[PDB]
Design a protein around this nucleic acid. Structure first.
Lengths: 95, 87, 114, 274, 64
RNA sequence: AACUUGAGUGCAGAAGAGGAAAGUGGAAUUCCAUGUGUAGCGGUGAAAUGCGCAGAGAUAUGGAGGAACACCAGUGGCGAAGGCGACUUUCUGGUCUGUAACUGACGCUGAUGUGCGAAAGCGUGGGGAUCAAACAGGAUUAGAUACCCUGGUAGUCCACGCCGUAAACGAUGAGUGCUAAGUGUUAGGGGGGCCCCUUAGUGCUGCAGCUAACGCAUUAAGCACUCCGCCUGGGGAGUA
């Protein structure tokens, strides 16, 4: 029922082979516990408005999910905090 | 509180006749589910004093509807008091 | 150096601290209105700021300074006279940016007088 | 939580005890128990070296895994139990293929939770993994100081250090006292704070209850005789009549820093407290 | 003057639409008062929310 | 026995700093470590205490920690009141509009009671950046246990409890209906960007009417009905 849009920024120095290893796995938790990810888009290396952990650029990925459990998005934020590749994330309930 | 789909089954359960939503058997039953939902919410968020105030208004509304039902006919009061678990 | 040495000016209701540093934040020289012998109520004056700026400006020319960025920090009366005291010495002022810190709240301002 | 006894007796007025509600089995295991014969301050010669130590209730030692090294094999928490030899509780864990051993009980480790040692482990309460793989900002207990020795730092009820940053082969760690220090990266920790967080709030009440943990009375030095203590003697009660309060053996006791200089740990303590 | 949110029919201001938002942030990223921009009270609120969401996601500067 | 307009429920919509919990940010203050750097900084009406020459202030980088959320921001919104402004998510309260699907007076007020209740204050355990009662000085005065300056402790923050007081004020109890208008603003509805009508809030003028006057005036302090609380000259005294 509830629809979430998740946008996260990956650091701009990540190895290209590791980028698909991280994006795959992190859209992986977003499809667990009744989650049925609809969109998974890439926005490319854009310029950040301000430095984030001494970074001036970064990869933007936007994933829209839908699930009436909300634990998929909480599991994302728990692991996104731990991961050093993701430097900023935001989960919006879209209605 | 309770979802709209959740409310409807309570309506269907205690409706007197079809297309009845305002009888003092469905209103009482709907409030009982609503009251228990806020009570469960306040087990965790104990100091939600603003939400607790709305719970006391729901309790008063059900209490006045139960007084009205008893004063009208005692049979329907007895059936409603046992099905819902209200003391 | 050759050029590109920023000048920070601190104009307050007291003396105006003028300091000339390189582009990477390394102080070359400095001269406040209080270092020129100025007494109070002389320290925060446009005349004092005039000598305050150029006194540090001459010390800059010895390192060969031909470019200054004026970073003014403070609401003081001796601001404009300070900047015209740099061009009068020939320092080729490029930019005039105000850097007076603005808190996004997050601190209790000291009590005002009575 | 803390239970406050009602003042039924004077010797029991302000007494308080632990409710022992987090404990789930009230009996030990015959195979992870070894004997502990109380020594009471006495040494290899037989002379009292440390004082205020003596008779107390018997106690069996419960072998703990301070060096959490079963890497890869998962383990289930079977029962959180009471330990007499420490402030925190212990938890029996059964490994996924038969062996069972005790550990220290973290704060909210529940019965039936899963815990993993190793290096590929997650960051959850109870799992042990080396300090090169523990994120900056995590609360860690049972921190080793030496690779393979066993947790030593932070092991008493409510002990938690924070991994604060890196250097090269050392990670920066703010130990409970307030000291920031460095510990080699190849050393293990355990995610979480140690339980019995209310152990420090208990009141003993009875003289005898303090004289059940193996404590013996401690006599204030200001009443021994001049031949027994520096503060002793005087006709009547006396103030400390010396420039500084002193210790039984003649060494200043209110301020003198007694840490041996020229130690091989000095290059590793950043800032200190206590 | 005209709102641009009622005139053009926008009923959902998106925080991903940075280009639309940059018309209301002035020279610092400072949110422009609705008297200056002429948006109604209803849309000044959802525009402020979108701007603040963009700032957090580094799609718009806090200061400039 | 009967009825819907009162009151509630159903359906379709609306806005909101309403509350609780957990997270995520940017600016700023302080402190710490370095690089540059030299004789002042700071403050007043003038001073001085004070911080510096053991390298302060300034400037650049980095780190630690706490607290509050610039712009948006308004006779703006929400809440019974106290009060509620960074963003996100999860629980959760209330209100408004339209419809007329249902019950047919199920309503108002409300002693005792039971809860909430700004700041300050207390206990326990944490935290402690900023500002700071008190305290130290340095000044002004004839004196200054004050206003001015320099610091500075509790507190200010969090979690539990306790306290239960404020010019807690619209100095205006709650409910219901009637009684000229004009012009705004917030949130909807229906008709012909504009105009008209309309519902509920929030404002400013202003009739009748009321008031000792000031003034109030469809958000009455007017005209009526129901219920509760309170007053009977000033001190003594909110004291026994």
């Amino acid at each position: 029922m509830r629809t979430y849009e998740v946008m996260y920024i990956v650091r701009p120095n990540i190895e290209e082979d590791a980028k698909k290893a991280l994006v795959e796995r992190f859209n992986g938790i977003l499809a667990t516990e009744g989650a049925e990810v609809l969109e998974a888009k890439d926005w490319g290396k854009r310029r950040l408005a301000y430095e984030i952990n001494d970074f001036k650029d970064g990869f933007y990925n936007i994933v829209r999910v839908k699930s009436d459990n909300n634990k998929a998005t909480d599991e994302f934020q728990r692991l996104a905090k731990i991961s050093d590749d993701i430097i900023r994330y935001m989960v919006i309930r879209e209605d | 509180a309770i979802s709209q789909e959740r409310k409807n089954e309570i309506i269907k359960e205690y409706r007197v006749h079809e297309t009845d939503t305002g009888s003092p058997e469905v209103q009482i039953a709907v409030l009982t589910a609503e009251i228990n939902a806020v009570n469960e919410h306040l087990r965790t968020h104990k100091k939600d004093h603003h939400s607790r105030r709305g719970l006391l208004k729901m309790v008063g509304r059900r209490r006045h509807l139960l007084n009205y039902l008893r004063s009208k006919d005692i049979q329907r009061y007895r059936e409603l008091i046992k099905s819902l678990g209200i003391r | 150096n050759i050029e590109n040495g920023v000048a920070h000016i601190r104009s307050t209701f007291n003396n105006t601290i003028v300091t000339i540093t390189d582009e990477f934040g390394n102080a070359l020289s400095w001269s406040s209105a209080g270092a020129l012998g100025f007494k109070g109520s002389k320290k925060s004056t446009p005349f004092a700021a005039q000598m305050a700026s150029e006194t540090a400006s001459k010390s800059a020319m010895e390192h060969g300074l031909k470019t200054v960025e004026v970073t003014v920090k403070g609401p003081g009366p001796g601001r404009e006279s300070a900047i015209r005291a740099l061009q009068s010495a020939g320092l080729e002022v490029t930019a005039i940016r105000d850097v007076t810190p603005v808190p996004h709240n997050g601190c209790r301002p000291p009590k005002r007088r009575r | 939580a803390i239970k406050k006894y009602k003042p039924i007796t004077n010797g029991r007025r302000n007494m308080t005890s632990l409710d022992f509600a987090e404990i789930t089995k009230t009996t030990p295991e015959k195979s992870l128990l070894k004997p502990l014969p109380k020594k009471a301050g006495r040494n290899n010669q037989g002379k009292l070296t440390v004082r205020h130590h003596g008779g107390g209730h018997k106690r069996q030692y419960r072998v703990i895994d301070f060096k959490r090294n079963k890497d890869g094999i998962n383990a289930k928490v079977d029962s959180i139990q009471y330990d007499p030899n420490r402030s925190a509780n212990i938890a029996l864990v059964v490994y996924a293929d038969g062996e069972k051993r005790y550990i220290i009980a973290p704060k909210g480790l529940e019965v039936g939770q899963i815990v993993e040692s190793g290096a590929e482990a997650d960051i959850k309460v109870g799992n042990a993994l080396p300090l090169q793989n523990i994120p900056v900002g995590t609360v860690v207990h049972n921190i080793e100081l030496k690779p393979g020795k066993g947790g030593q730092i932070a092991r008493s009820a409510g002990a938690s250090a924070q991994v604060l940053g890196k250097e090269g082969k050392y990670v920066l760690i703010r130990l409970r006292s307030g000291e920031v220090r460095m510990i080699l990266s190849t050393c293990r920790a355990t995610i979480g704070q140690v339980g019995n967080l209310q152990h420090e709030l208990v009141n003993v009440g009875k003289a005898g209850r303090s004289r059940w943990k193996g404590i013996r009375p401690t006599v204030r030095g200001s009443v021994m005789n001049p031949n027994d203590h520096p503060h002793g003697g005087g006709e009547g009660r006396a103030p400390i009549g010396r420039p500084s309060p002193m210790s039984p053996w003649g060494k200043p006791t209110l301020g003198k820093k007694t840490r041996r200089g020229k130690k091989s740990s000095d290059k590793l303590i950043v800032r200190g407290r206590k | 003057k005209v709102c641009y949110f009622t005139a053009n029919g926008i009923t959902h201001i998106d925080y991903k639409d940075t280009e639309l938002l940059k018309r209301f942030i002035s020279e610092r990223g400072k949110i422009l008062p609705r008297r200056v921009t002429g948006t109604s009270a209803k849309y000044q609120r959802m525009l402020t929310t979108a701007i603040k969401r963009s700032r957090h996601m580094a799609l718009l500067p806090y200061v400039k």
